[PDB]
């Protein structure tokens, strides 16, 4: 074995988990082979890695990678092509057969037949927030990453619960500073002074009765990921329910 490699599959909750095996012909056989080649007056080898594709299942299909693969042949390089893989709905882990081939055109144009094709198990190795009191769940129908200027915009929230008491929630945005190491002492304040100053909710204390279009305008600009001021609350048995979801860039 010469080309040392690793299998990296990264898991995302946008129903995607990409795969990019990294390869690098490391020093272990290089320290011997590039001194035999140094005795034979060569220090720029070229193993023509040009043929490589993946396999998904028993239907061994070449999945279309997100990146390209031309004739890659140089000395001491290292490559990691990224391939889009569909994320499963559960722990159905598709074992995979990583196939590759490099035709080792050595010094004095000496080709050598070699390939790197083997199989393993391609495990990854690892919107909505639920309630605390009721069966209520909160999601935003409009997409949680959205573009706007400093002007007005429409924002829309899902309320789905059990219809045993299907009512009496209230919103309020609570535009005041949470009053709160010295650089962290002026970091938590500058977090809170742009939470409570950025957007303003133009219909607060909105009685809900499912669907409601909540009404904001933002003043100053930035990335308001998990815009966390707004609080709905159940008027019986008052618990501070929070919706820490959604985002808004203002450029």
């Amino acid at each position: 074995l010469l080309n040392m490699r690793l299998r990296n599959i990264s898991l995302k909750s946008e129903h995607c988990i990409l795969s990019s095996l990294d390869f690098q012909t490391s020093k272990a056989s290089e320290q011997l082979t590039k001194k035999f080649i140094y005795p034979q007056e060569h220090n720029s080898f070229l193993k023509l890695n040009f043929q490589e594709i993946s396999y998904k299942l028993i239907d061994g299909t070449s999945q279309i990678e997100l990146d390209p693969i031309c004739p890659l042949k140089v000395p001491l390089t290292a490559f990691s092509y990224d391939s889009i893989s569909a994320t499963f709905k559960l722990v159905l882990l598709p074992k995979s057969t990583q196939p590759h081939r490099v035709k080792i055109t050595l010094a004095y144009e000496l080709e050598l037949h070699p390939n790197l094709k083997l199989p393993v198990r391609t495990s990854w190795e690892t919107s909505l927030v639920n309630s605390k009191l009721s069966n209520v769940k909160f999601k935003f129908i409009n997409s949680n990453i959205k573009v706007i200027k400093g002007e007005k915009f429409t924002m829309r929230l899902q309320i789905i619960n059990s219809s045993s008491s299907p009512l009496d929630l209230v919103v309020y945005y609570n535009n005041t500073i949470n009053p709160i190491t010295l650089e962290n002492q002026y970091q938590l304040h500058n977090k809170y002074r742009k939470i409570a100053e950025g957007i303003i909710l133009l219909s607060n204390d909105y009685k809900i009765p499912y669907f409601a279009d909540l009404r904001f305008i933002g003043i100053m600009s930035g990335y308001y990921g998990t815009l966390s001021g707004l609080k709905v609350l159940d008027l019986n048995t008052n618990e501070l329910i929070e919706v820490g979801n959604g985002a808004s860039v203002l450029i």
Binding site: K149, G150, I177, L182, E183, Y186, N190, R193, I200, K207
Partner: protein, 280 residues
């Protein structure tokens, strides 16, 4: 920016940031108030401050509509807000002891006088929809219930301990311009409070425009000649200064923070001027 002049309260502060450029921004505040009707008819609701003209609103039978009225601040060196407090409608009476602390009397005077200041120029006007004849007004004397400590900070700047302003000349700086920053400090009408500390300490903190909390050793960033503590004089103006040699990024904000000692949590004013410069 331009073409945002489609929203009724923008163009007031645009039209006085174009002309009368001494009257700057980041000092205009918005007062936010929600109407709610206990009636079956629609109401048309044109609000006037001393020159602000809201457009033709509509409130149907329960639907609140938060009017966003822009005003300016008040200047603590222009009005005295420590004058005879809570003046009686008719003179005389028993003349009994107040029975309250002098400090409490100060905050009661401020929380009354700012309230009547925002009463005295705010006039709504309205008309019904289904009749279009029975116009009317309201008055807000029974409406505005009191102020609390957020409100008396936001209208009245003199409640704060210090008042600073801070300017950076020519905000297009390429790479290699060591440029002084100018800070003008003036203690407020609460210069009478403490007076046993005669020095207070002014941390100048550095924020990125997008991200936050640049560490103070600050390589590939602003380098500073001096240090960022610079103790300031109570009861007198003091022009601190620091020179900024920038290395490479896009844009930054400067702000200050006053801390009354150099121990932890003795900190008193999280002040927020935040000038931005643009670096190529």
């Amino acid at each position: 920016s331009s073409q945002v002049e489609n929203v009724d309260w923008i163009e007031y502060v645009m039209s006085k940031i174009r002309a009368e450029s001494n009257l700057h921004s980041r000092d205009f505040i918005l007062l936010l108030l929600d109407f709610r009707n206990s009636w079956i008819d629609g109401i048309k609701l044109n609000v006037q401050f001393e020159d602000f003209t809201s457009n033709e609103y509509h409130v149907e039978a329960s639907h609140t509509s938060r009017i966003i009225v822009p005003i300016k601040k008040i200047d603590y060196k222009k009005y005295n807000f420590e004058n005879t407090p809570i003046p009686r409608i008719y003179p005389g009476r028993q003349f009994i002891q107040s029975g309250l602390n002098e400090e409490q009397t100060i905050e009661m005077r401020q929380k009354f006088w700012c309230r009547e200041h925002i009463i005295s120029k705010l006039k709504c006007n309205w008309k019904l929809t289904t009749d279009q004849s029975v116009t009317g007004s309201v008055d807000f004397n029974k409406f505005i219930e009191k102020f609390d400590h957020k409100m008396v900070y936001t209208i009245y700047p003199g409640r704060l301990f210090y008042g600073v302003q801070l300017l950076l000349d020519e905000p297009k700086v390429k790479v290699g311009e060591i440029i002084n920053l100018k800070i003008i400090t003036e203690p407020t009408s609460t210069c009478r409070r403490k007076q046993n500390s005669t020095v207070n300490f002014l941390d100048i903190v550095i924020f990125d425009s997008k991200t936050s909390k640049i560490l103070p050793r600050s390589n590939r960033r602003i380098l500073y000649n001096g240090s960022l503590t610079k103790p300031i004089s109570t009861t007198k103006v003091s022009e601190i200064n620091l020179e900024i040699i920038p290395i490479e990024k896009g844009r930054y904000e400067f702000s200050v923070c006053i801390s009354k000692s150099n121990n932890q949590d003795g900190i008193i004013q999280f002040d927020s001027e935040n000038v931005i410069l643009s670096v190529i």
